Amino acid sequence: SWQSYVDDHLMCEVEGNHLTHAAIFGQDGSVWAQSSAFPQLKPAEIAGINKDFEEAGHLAPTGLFLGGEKYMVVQGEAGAVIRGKKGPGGVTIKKTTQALVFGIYDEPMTGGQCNLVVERLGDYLIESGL
């Protein structure tokens, strides 16, 4: 179940903290499963997401946009991870073979605890073909 992947493995608490929002998108833009309040993502936002996984740095100018709200781009894993920052929160976008794993965190959480749950689940999905 894609929903339990969101709830039990992207929204799991680590030291009392959990991601604000989490979602698993198919690379075709379609939501596979998301947290209740995950923002809706404009189709251009997912294109800019996808082209940045091709050759990084496409999103670094202009920044990374998700649901209209902008995140300033920060260092990632080229072709595997996109990371962004907005004040005391940010986002991790881990690309699997078929999907896009999203984690959005706020001020109690760290970028580190975000990359933990996001890139974890992602790396596991790649190993099972997803």
Side-chain angles (χ1 to χ4, degrees):
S1 191
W2 288 114
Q3 183 61 43
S4 42
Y5 275 92
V6 179
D7 305 3
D8 302 0
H9 272 356
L10 285 176
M11 293 269 108
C12 68
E13 278 190 20
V14 190
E15 308 168 18
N17 279 349
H18 59 61
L19 299 172
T20 326
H21 313 302
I24 311 278
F25 284 62
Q27 284 180 16
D28 76 284
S30 79
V31 170
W32 288 5
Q34 61 181 39
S35 35
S36 49
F38 186 88
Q40 283 261 4
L41 300 187
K42 301 176 158 47
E45 306 180 325
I46 290 122
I49 282 182
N50 259 300
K51 196 159 187 186
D52 197 80
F53 287 114
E54 282 192 61
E55 193 160 337
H58 188 295
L59 284 177
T62 77
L64 160 76
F65 272 110
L66 310 153
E69 299 222 318
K70 189 213 255 187
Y71 288 82
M72 200 135 277
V73 189
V74 292
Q75 190 215 229
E77 283 176 39
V81 159
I82 287 176
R83 288 196 202 102
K85 206 73 174 55
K86 200 182 56 37
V91 55
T92 323
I93 309 174
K94 167 78 158 149
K95 164 174 144 151
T96 57
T97 49
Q98 291 178 51
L100 299 158
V101 186
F102 290 76
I104 299 176
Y105 72 94
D106 278 308
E107 158 144 9
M109 268 204 46
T110 37
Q113 277 138 262
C114 188
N115 312 329
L116 176 71
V117 279
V118 170
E119 301 177 357
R120 171 140 69 77
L121 188 62
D123 276 338
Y124 169 54
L125 292 164
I126 298 135
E127 286 231 330
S128 317
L130 306 163

